[PDB]
């Protein structure tokens, strides 16, 4: 009869690096062979030091995201202190969870600061179990966009290779790159990029386009 | 897969997208949906690609014995007869949507063929998943007794339409100008869009993959 | 779709809508749903287009072979019986209803609908497809025996204006063909020739 | 799948259990007790589905042990076997069923020896054997044939020996040791578990 | 996932593999299988992630307020019956979480096996995940009560190395704990990757 | 609705420099039935916004009551603040995804017009509580037929006129007319400016089938 | 997908004058790897080889039965078949199975046997053949290979270049698949000579 | 069943076939499917026999009880707008197409359909039920605006004698009711009575 | 439910199998044999549904019988293999398809041991060590821990026994006797019958 979930397309990626957290979208909104719109990002700015990134079904991230503005305004007021990086995925696994029996369609990647100032990415299945890891990509490009960054930022299966700490310009090159080369291939994923850059000064926005086709 | 077709004053204009896709994949970006049935007569296909292709190749074979035997130039109704009643006895199980277009004796003709037989001869056809979006540029700007420079923009668009707003097309603009003097198999006849130069050269250096064994069989010229 | 045929004296007249949808999608606003089986012979089609078009080929062909051999103009009834035998032979696999009007120099105008599952009648008047419900009351009020030439064409098209008014399937030109010993005539109405009836008018 | 055995003697209830616990293809445990001590002189041994058995045996025996604290004398084994039936019965339309198969052996001093058999039906039946499992059409045959009311407690105990031995021979699953226990007027007296 | 755990002489030795995987994509090699309840107790998480995260997270928030309450540390078996109940109320829901809970306490070192289903056993050598077969029978074949903690620790690692090598869902690397009557200690994180060559070596 | 029954087919909005105009037909069909074709399926919520809904019209005139129930209120308040079209639009997902979260969706698509602070806005929302802004935006059909047409226009030229946006509804309108069975001539064109929202009703569309003769 | 049971990874890729193929070397009937010496890759002529991956019986039937046919073909022709040739001669066989085909999805590399011009080709499970000028994926871990590759890709690579892109796409994808992997096997395909390499990959 | 209400100039016309059948068995030949709201606001019922006669009465009460807490005759739309909720409420829980056609002071005679799912619309003619889609046609060629109640009356006839002729589930007398200022007139056409309309032959 | 292993060393291949035959809850016998002597060097075990097995087992027999027959010499293990793959194949789109797990073993005076492994969906692999039913899955770990290219047909037996020892163990099944066999250049040599009561 009626179907509560659709899939509306998206790939959403965040590297972490030891001053600096890049959480990176495409724009593309879809719906079956049809785009909604090419201009609705899939990150969002929590805090000053956070950002998270969502795909997945669209009326759930919506909700979700309004959800988790709500818990950080009642957490301020209660302990005084704006939420922590790590203390947000921690609230997110919980009210993922909560609907586990009609669960949430949407992968959520955080990235932000830590308190010592470190990137720090979160990723967490639609459910809700999260992992620290220092890249993660997600959403419909996911498996297109990982196996680069475990080959560059993680250096896998490399041999001979110094391992020089990353850097903003170089991770910055690394999102753009990969989100291209994602774009020949996902039709879900396109039209432009959209990298929020997480550091002590504060959260930048920069847009680069990928293929409209 | 937009593919789309008009008659012109002096013939035919087809047009392609140039996207294979399986499931949610880009498989092809430079796939060939125009293919030959006869000098003069020319086939869109969408639909299943394998079916398409083989439903053309068999088509093709039978009007070029045909036209061996008769001594003269394919008719467009022979092909539209052979597809629409091979199409018919698979009963759609042969996925093959396909707009064929000629120019022949009688005159310039423009046909759409279902998979399940089904065949409307029209003077503008679109098939595919972006045929919708193509079919609303042909409502908005066609006129009969178009020229053929004319033609081949409007038809350019259609496809252009699918390509832009369709997820399943994408890539590249083919066009086929038949007519009675002349054919122009035009491929690429416009490129939309093309990937981004890459900013960062990972360039994997030599030594850099560990090999646990090696063999080297000289291969004599 | 919406076809309809009615007999007057010495010919038939025979219309159609020009409408073919893919669910909610029209894939051409103006198919021709009248064939000529034969020279004063022709079939309106409704359902499926594929098991339409190729059972009428097939007519065609038997028809033509038929006339051929025997050296005489074809029966109605002929063209009739054999659809209504292709049609009785694969009702489960065919979902085609055909409604088949001519001349013939022995019964004159005859119409036989054959509707789906391949029965053969004889009627005065006959309506198919989606839209013929919508008009089974206007037609059975209207009908008038004695009905001339130009009062068919009349009744036919205000008839299919409508059914393609109150049907989604039906739509697009009225197609009309009016078969006589003298020959075939075909006429295609669209828009203000196309009959209108005032729609209600309280916002 | 896993297996319940018990005879009713003259003066005496010999009750004997499979000792494996197992997951899909695996033997997780060969040591597993499928016998609850509800009272001094009651024993439950319920199998059945995974979670029922373990839950619903537990509430039986906290209950008995409540009434034993409560009033200071221990429930007849008629009485418990009802007040089982009449929980699993309770549970079989509600929305939470425990699918358990048990088998109650208790000795009363005015009533004498009780062995009875409820299936996950709640269907109480007083029987002088009884048995459950996959093992149980090809045990009781030998129990029909060779049981006796006035049976001895060695014999009951050789008689038990042949029904496991007969397990080994012809039954698909592994089963190979079993839990051997004979409640009395004395009380409840663990007994040799026998091995193969 | 493999996930393995035996009490010997010297106390319980803890072992699991560090995939993650959603469908046939491995979407994590570095996820750690056991949760730290106590200074003195570990939980093994197998099954879907999330279910086992929340349900010893909150077994992990009681046995807290049961130590704050009562002044003294839950037991082994206490903390073992308690996510089984837990788990029972949401019986035939879906849940998939097979868990082992090891600890040592004042009866002495405890081993006690979880399931989604309600199963709890106590056991000296238990194995849970898709690779529990494949352990199984390593650790089997070279286990023994009297085994020095040196042997011990290269028979965790060996039964978690064989199980990834057939198990599909099963990589990553080994994180070895070993729980003392002083607490848990963290013992090593091994790749299987540096294993295979030292074994195949 | 688990069931749809009368339904109405695609709404097509444009937004222009100084307002938003939307477009929709005027007929309500029971499957392929033309039952109702006097019935109006755009709104004026207020004279800042305007909301037009595809889908079933029961739940439309549910909705409608609902909203408009809601301006009264406010109205009477007198306070002087308005709902902008933009919170109308998130009361509208707010309200899409509950109903959708109880699985008991209300079976429609509507695209939220208004002009407020000078800035123009229009907005989509499913059944489903999808929801998002664009420049040009249709539901049903017209995402495939006429989406097409008003994004190519927008992108040669993103800033368009009144009477530019008004032609190219009425095009847009006729395309749907040619290839949607569910499509009726008689139309409603809503036109949102700084002055208020004007709804004109009801036009029709002039139709070519010269094509019927050129086919052989 | 009946795909996903035996699992299975192959990529082609095109040199300047050379092409490499390569495939995962694990046979696994499902979660579980029976063999870690698996051949996907199979040759056909010499300097033409084409790697199938699938269903495990597929795979070792279509190879079986392309083999009866170009040996029949190049009898009578008295000649060794052109790259194109095979990927025609494939697609027919797969295309007379069309209503219950063999579940595999072939790659083809070869160079002309006269201009030694590189060729990389794929066919669907139906007989559709794609050609392309730089890489063909095909498998369980397509998309993974897919992303690897678009990046790691340049135009004009010499012998060894085309072998380390290969290899760390080829590593790198089937370390994100679980089905695929154990060891990966690269051919490189050059007038002169056939250098078959199998590089160091995880056991997991 | 058939059902049609057609607006004259000072009141409405509503008719209705009198078959009531449980699959092909008329368990009802004589049922009236025009029955009183109030004093002159009528409906006309279709679809499950329960839920329409259940709707109905549940109007009647709630109708009843607000005319004399306001000492008013009560509008029209207001008996069309409480039947609208009801439908709309429980439209998975009910089968129910209604026909609201009545008299009141203030807007004169007035015809709103409320068709299943809750829709409430106001149209100058109203047809429902299975027997409506044969005269759907019929209906909008002979409608002519500014029509008398006694041409309303042959016209209501004319058509539901068409429906019935077609339509298995329709049949039986013809019930026609006019409402007015002046009052409720209710009429019943059987036998000759019922239009006849010529059959085909040869 | 039914056992099939292989071991294969430099100059022999060890093939056990389940002695019991069952139906329902009952085993019916215990001295089943599931081993097929398919030529004086090889043999087939095969596991799989009633009826199944003997057939397609009998019938390759008997065809690489013929080949010796008709020929005077008999077909190499990786021929018999290669035939038995093809006939399962073909039959696996067909309406009868056989549903059996095939365990080939053989020596070649030319080409030595050799062990071949061949599922239902008939997919051939040549392997060291292979095992079928739901035995390999705890058996097969021991196997990779414990098996050295290099072992001694003495060491393989000890192998062996520990294979069978775990599945005593662990397995839910009552599988008590296995049969052992031998290939080698003298031929197939049937061992003593490893029984754990
Ligand atoms: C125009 C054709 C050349 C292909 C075109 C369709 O219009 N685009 C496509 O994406 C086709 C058609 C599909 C959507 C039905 N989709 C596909 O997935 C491919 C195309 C690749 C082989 C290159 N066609 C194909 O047959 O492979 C998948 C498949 C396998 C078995 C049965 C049916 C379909
Ligand atoms: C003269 C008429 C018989 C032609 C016309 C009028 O009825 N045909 C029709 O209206 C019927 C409607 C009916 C099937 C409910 N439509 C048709 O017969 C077919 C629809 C297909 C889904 C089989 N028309 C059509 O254009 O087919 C295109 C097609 C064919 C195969 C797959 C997908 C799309
Ligand atoms: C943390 C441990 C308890 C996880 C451990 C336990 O088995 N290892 C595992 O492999 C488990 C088992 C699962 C395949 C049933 N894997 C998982 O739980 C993985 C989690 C990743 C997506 C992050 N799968 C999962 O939870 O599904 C979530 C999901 C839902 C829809 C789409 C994609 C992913
Ligand atoms: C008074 C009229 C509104 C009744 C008229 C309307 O068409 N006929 C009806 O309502 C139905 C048929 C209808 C469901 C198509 N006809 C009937 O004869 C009966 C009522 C008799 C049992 C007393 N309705 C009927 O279907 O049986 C009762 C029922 C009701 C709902 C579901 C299943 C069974």
Partial sequence: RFSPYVFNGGTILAIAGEDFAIVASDTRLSEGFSIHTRDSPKCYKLTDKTVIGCSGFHGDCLTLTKIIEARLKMYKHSNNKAMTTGAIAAMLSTILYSRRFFPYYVYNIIGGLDEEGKGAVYSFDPVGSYQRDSFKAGGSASAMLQPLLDNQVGFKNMQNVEHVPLSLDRAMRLVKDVFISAAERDVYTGDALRICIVTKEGIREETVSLRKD | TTIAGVVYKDGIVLGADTRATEGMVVADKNCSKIHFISPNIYCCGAGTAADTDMTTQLISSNLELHSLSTGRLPRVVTANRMLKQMLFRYQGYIGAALVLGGVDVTGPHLYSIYPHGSTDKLPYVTMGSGSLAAMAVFEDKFRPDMEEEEAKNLVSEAIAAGIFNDLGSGSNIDLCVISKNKLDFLRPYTVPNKKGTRLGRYRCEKGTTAVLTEKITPLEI | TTIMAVQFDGGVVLGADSRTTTGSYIANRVTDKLTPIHDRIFCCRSGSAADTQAVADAVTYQLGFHSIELNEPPLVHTAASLFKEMCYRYREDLMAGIIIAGWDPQEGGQVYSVPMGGMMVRQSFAIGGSGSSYIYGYVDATYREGMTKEECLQFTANALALAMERDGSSGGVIRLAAIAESGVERQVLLGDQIPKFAVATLP | ?196 | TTTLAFKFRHGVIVAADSRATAGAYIASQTVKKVIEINPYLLGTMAGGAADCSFWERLLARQCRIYELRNKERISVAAASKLLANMVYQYKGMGLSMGTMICGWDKRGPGLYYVDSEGNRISGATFSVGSGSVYAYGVMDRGYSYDLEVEQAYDLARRAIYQATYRDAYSGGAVNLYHVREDGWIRVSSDNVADLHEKYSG | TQNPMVTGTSVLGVKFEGGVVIAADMLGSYGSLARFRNISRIMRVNNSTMLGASGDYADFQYLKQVLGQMVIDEELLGDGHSYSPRAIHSWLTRAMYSRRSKMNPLWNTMVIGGYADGESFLGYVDMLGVAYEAPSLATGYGAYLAQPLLREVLEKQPVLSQTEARDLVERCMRVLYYRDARSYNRFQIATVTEKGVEIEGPLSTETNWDIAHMIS | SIMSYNGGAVMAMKGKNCVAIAADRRFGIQAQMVTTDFQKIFPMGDRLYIGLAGLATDVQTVAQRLKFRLNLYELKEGRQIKPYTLMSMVANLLYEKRFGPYYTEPVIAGLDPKTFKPFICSLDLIGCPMVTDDFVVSGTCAEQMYGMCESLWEPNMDPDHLFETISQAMLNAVDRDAVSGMGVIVHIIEKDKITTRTLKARMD
């Fill in chain 4, 1 to 196: 799948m896993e297996y319940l055995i018990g005879i009713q003697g003259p003066d005496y209830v010999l009750v004997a259990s499979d000792r494996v616990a197992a997951s899909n293809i695996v033997q997780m445990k060969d040591d597993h007790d499928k016998m609850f001590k509800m009272s001094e002189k009651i024993l439950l041994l319920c199998v059945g589905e995974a979670g029922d058995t373990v839950q619903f045996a537990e509430y039986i025996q906290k209950n008995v042990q409540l009434y034993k604290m409560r009033n200071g004398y221990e429930l007849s084994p008629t009485a418990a076997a009802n007040f089982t039936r009449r929980n699993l019965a309770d549970c079989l339309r509600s929305r939470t069923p425990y699918h358990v198969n048990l088998l109650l052996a208790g000795y009363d001093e005015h009533e004498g020896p009780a062995l009875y058999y409820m299936d996950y039906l709640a269907a109480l039946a007083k029987a002088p054997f009884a048995a459950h499992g996959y093992g149980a059409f090809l045990t009781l045959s030998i129990l029909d044939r060779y049981y006796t009311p006035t049976i001895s407690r060695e014999r009951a105990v050789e008689l038990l020996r042949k029904c496991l031995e007969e397990l080994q021979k012809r039954f698909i699953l592994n089963l190979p040791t079993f839990s051997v226990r004979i409640i009395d007027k004395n009380g409840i007296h663990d007994l040799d578990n026998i091995s193969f």
